[PDB]
């Protein structure tokens, strides 16, 4: 019967950028992950909670679908326990992440002919963010002893700089879309279940 709204996540027009990653709370629906895992479109389908094949057998309280664009070198940082500016200042998974990371080369549309600049990532933050935090804040960065009272100045960086995405870039400087399916069981009864 009714299939979960995966089309509105994986098949959308404009994804979030990694500092401001979108979340959709998939629940009260049947989740046909066989549509996903059989797709020739994906580069990466790393499942950490369970083996990818068994996803159509399981049921969960909710499946949070976290969506964002990152560089083709940075997709790796999305795995749990990874280190690096995406894993530490933008989108962090917990050590026991019970979910799947799915990613595809999206240079087809996320790249503009003279370069695209719409996607921002946080290069700087006073501390690593905690698992599944998101930090929208544009507050000027304190990169120097001098207090950044002025809007801009020495060591008063914008904690967010923009990607360089161009069609002729290498695999690595290309805009990989990522979605992270964080499956979750709680006291609440199970709703999102594979099809029969």
């Amino acid at each position, epitope marked *: 019967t009714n299939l979960c709204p995966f089309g509105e996540v994986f098949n959308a027009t404009r994804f979030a950028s990694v500092y401001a990653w979108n979340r959709k709370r998939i629940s009260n629906c049947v989740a046909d992950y066989s549509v996903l895992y059989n797709s020739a479109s994906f580069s990466t389908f790393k499942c950490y909670g369970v083996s990818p094949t068994k996803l159509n057998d399981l049921c969960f309280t909710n499946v949070y679908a976290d969506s964002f664009v990152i560089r083709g070198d940075e997709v790796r940082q999305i795995a749990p326990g990874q280190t690096g500016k995406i894993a530490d200042y933008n989108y962090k998974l917990p050590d026991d992440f019970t979910g799947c990371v799915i990613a595809w080369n999206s240079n087809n549309l996320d790249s503009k002919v003279g370069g695209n600049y719409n996607y921002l990532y946080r290069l700087f933050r006073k501390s690593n963010l905690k698992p599944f935090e998101r930090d929208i804040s544009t507050e000027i960065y304190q*990169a120097g*002893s001098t207090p950044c009272n002025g809007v801009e100045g*020495f*060591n008063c960086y914008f904690p967010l700089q923009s990607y360089g995405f161009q069609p002729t870039n290498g695999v690595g400087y290309q805009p990989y879309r990522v979605v992270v399916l964080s499956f979750e069981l709680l006291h609440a009864p199970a709703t999102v279940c594979g099809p029969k």
Partner: antibody
Amino acid sequence: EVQLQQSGPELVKPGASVRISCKTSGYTFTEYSMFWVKQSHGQSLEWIGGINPNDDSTTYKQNFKGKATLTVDKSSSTAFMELRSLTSEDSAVYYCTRDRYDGRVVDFWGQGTTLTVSS
Amino acid sequence: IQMTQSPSSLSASLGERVSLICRASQEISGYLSWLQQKPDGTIKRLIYAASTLDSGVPKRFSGSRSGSEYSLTISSPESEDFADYYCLQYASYPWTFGGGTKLEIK
């Protein structure tokens, strides 16, 4: 061990330029900013300016901006100051320093390069 | 803009109390550091922030934001402590310093 190894005492006749290094160690070089100070024999110390090496960013005292030039090389992990038009104004003990926001501010310094422009 | 260190030179016996001041014309929001300079070239930080020190600072000498004035005060002199002292205004670029104050035996 933190050590701002720097260049030894130096002399050139006036109307010229000079090379001054400050090697740094005991930390990852791009995790801290670099600044500079000019202290004369008969005058107090003054801030020349600073080149955060990681972002290749540079700020100066307006007075020295027209005669200083700060640089780094990442592979050498070393700071480098160039001074031009060495006049009767251009002689002091010159000093390198490193900084950050989390408490490590203008703490450790280089030995003190006594640039002399006399003949 | 720079702040003014009250004295140029100050003299003492061993054991005498020593107060060193760097008064302010405009509020630097409590951003300031103290440095000591040996006449033979040794520079090292004493104090930063508001009465805060780190690394290895001689004994426990600390000052305070005395309203419009910034300060250093010490519970003893020492043979090495008899040298020149400076306040740095890292409150805003360009960084500025006080003229320095020299601490001496009688």
